[PDB]
Design a protein around this ligand. Structure first.
Ligand SMILES: Cc1c(OCCNCCCF)ccc(F)c1[C@@H]1c2[nH]c3ccccc3c2C[C@@H](C)N1CC(F)(F)CO
Length: 238
């Protein structure tokens, strides 16, 4: 059968998002050589991550209810924020370092290698440390990542279709609140924590904007490339 997004319980939402999670990818460099472009390695990894991101987005409840056109718009707006939140998530347990891959752990000083890269590393590190200080949970993380996908390009857009995106966002909010209530936080505590997490999302937006400026100054997937990737997914084996 098929669940409609708006009928999911909190536990079914959590379960669907956990099940949709992409794998952790490794960097493609020979462990026999030192002698590699940092830019090259990060570009190669991001590219492989994007393929998995397409498969993931298709599994975010509500996403496939939208038109192909609207799906591509959302991904085009959100793809860097999504790569960034995943990065800061897995870097939480590594104070002062970014875990790009289990075989690609980088500090501040290594970031200085590429020009304009150091401001962005620092902002990512601050996000990772804020998430560690808040003890961000995996269940919360998957909800935040889905919120990024559905909200990033909603205002830069068929009005009844917008209510649907807004109703799916309300469902994800409900799911976050339910996780926090089960964790034993009080009402005010539930609200304060929700606020804190949503406010971090504006910082993630900021980082993505700065990231995009930096990428465009030199790689960036266009509406057309994302459309092509979303469409090609239909030809993948089950
Ligand atoms: C994302 C990106 C890039 O993306 C190119 C897009 N690929 C094209 C799509 C069609 F194939 C090209 C070089 C990079 F160094 C990075 C990196 C980068 N790589 C990652 C890999 C996994 C997880 C997170 C990241 C980040 C965040 C972050 C530090 N990124 C730096 C910046 F923010 F993009 C610079 O402004």
């Amino acid at each position: 059968g098929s669940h409609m997004a708006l009928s999911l319980t909190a536990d079914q939402m959590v379960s669907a998002l956990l099940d949709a999670e992409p794998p952790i990818l490794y960097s493609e460099y020979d462990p026999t050589r030192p002698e590699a472009s940092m830019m090259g390695l990060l570009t190669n990894l991001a590219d492989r991550e994007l393929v998995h991101m397409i498969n993931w987005a298709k599994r975010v409840p509500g996403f496939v209810d939208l038109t192909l056109h609207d799906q591509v718009h959302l991904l085009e707006s959100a793809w860097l924020e999504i790569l960034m939140i995943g990065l800061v998530w897995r870097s939480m347990e590594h104070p002062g370092k970014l875990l790009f891959a289990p075989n690609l752990l980088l500090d501040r000083n290594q970031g200085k290698s590429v020009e304009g890269m150091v401001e962005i590393f620092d902002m990512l590190l601050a996000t990772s440390s804020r998430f560690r200080m808040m003890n961000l949970q995996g269940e919360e993380f998957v909800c935040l990542k889905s919120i990024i996908l559905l909200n990033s390009g909603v205002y830069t857009f068929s009005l009844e279709e917008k209510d649907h995106i807004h109703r799916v966002l309300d469902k994800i909010t409900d799911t976050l609140i339910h996780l926090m209530a089960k964790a034993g936080l009080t009402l005010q505590q539930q609200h304060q924590r929700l606020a804190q997490l949503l406010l971090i999302l504006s910082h993630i937006r900021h980082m993505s904007n700065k990231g995009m400026e930096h990428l465009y100054s030199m790689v960036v997937p266009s509406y057309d490339l994302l459309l092509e990737m979303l469409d090609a997914h239909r030809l993948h084996a089950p």
